[PDB]
Amino acid sequence: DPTEAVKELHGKILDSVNVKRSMPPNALLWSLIENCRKEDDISFLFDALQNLRRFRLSNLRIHDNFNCNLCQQVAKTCVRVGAINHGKRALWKHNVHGLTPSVASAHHMMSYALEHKN
RNA sequence: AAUUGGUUUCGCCCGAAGCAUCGGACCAAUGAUCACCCAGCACUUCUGUGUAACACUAGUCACACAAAGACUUUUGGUGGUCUU
Numbered sequence: 001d002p003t004e005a006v007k008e009l010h011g012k013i014l015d016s017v018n019v020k021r022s023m024p025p026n027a028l029l030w031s032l033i034e035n036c037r038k039e040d041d042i043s044f045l046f047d048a049l050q051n052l053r054r055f056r057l058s059n060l061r062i063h064d065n066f067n068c069n070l071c072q073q074v075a076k077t078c079v080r081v082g083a084i085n086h087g088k089r090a091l092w093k094h095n096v097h098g099l100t101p102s103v104a105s106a107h108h109m110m111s112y113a114l115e116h117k118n
Numbered sequence: 119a120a121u122u123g124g125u126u127u128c129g130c131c132c133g134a135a136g137c138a139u140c141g142g143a144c145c146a147a148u149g150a151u152c153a154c155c156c157a158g159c160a161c162u163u164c165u166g167u168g169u170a171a172c173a174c175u176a177g178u179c180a181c182a183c184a185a186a187g188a189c190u191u192u193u194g195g196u197g198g199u200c201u202u
């Protein structure tokens with residue numbers, strides 16, 4: 001059901017976060033979010049988004065969340081894919097993925113809703 | 119005449135488990151010291167993407183860009199050495 005480009009990225013940084021015990025460089029996380037097409041990869045992106053939040057504090061002792069521009073780009077990834085239920089989770093104040101709510105995410109949701117006419 | 123069993127002690131042969139002492143051996147971990155790889159805090163962008171004025175639709179600032187950069191410094195890994 002998912003795509004191979006996001007699957008082979010996903011298992012790669014899961015192998016890095018669980019076996020090598022070093023955090024993966026953010027370039028491949030970004031190339032994971034740039035390659036999402038169908039409905040059935042954003043849950044694997046959420047699994048990665050959860051594992052990285054775990055590892056950043058667990059090993060590297062990093063307390064803050066993912067940053068605001070990353071919130072906008074994961075919002076635009078999910079809303080261009082079309083999963084509205086997964087996209088609206090990006091504005092949640094209490095989430096396991098560390099997605100700080102912002103305004104640009106709601107702007108992207110309202111832009112898609114403008115195009116979709118709901 | 120011959121004959122059967124003990125019990126104690128001493129000299130030789132072999133050496134179960136064990137404690138002791140050496141020896142290679144970086145065996146398996148731990149500590150130290152080198153390097154190498156990500157990432158973070160400071161930063162600079164002619165880089166893309168959003169907020170807010172204005173200007174008629176372009177500019178100007180605020181941001182995070184991780185998108186790079188290059189000295190530092192830290193967290194975690196990796197690979198060598200300690201008269202091991």
Ligand SMILES: [Mg+2]
Nearest residue numbers: 133134135136
């Ligand atoms: Mg013996």
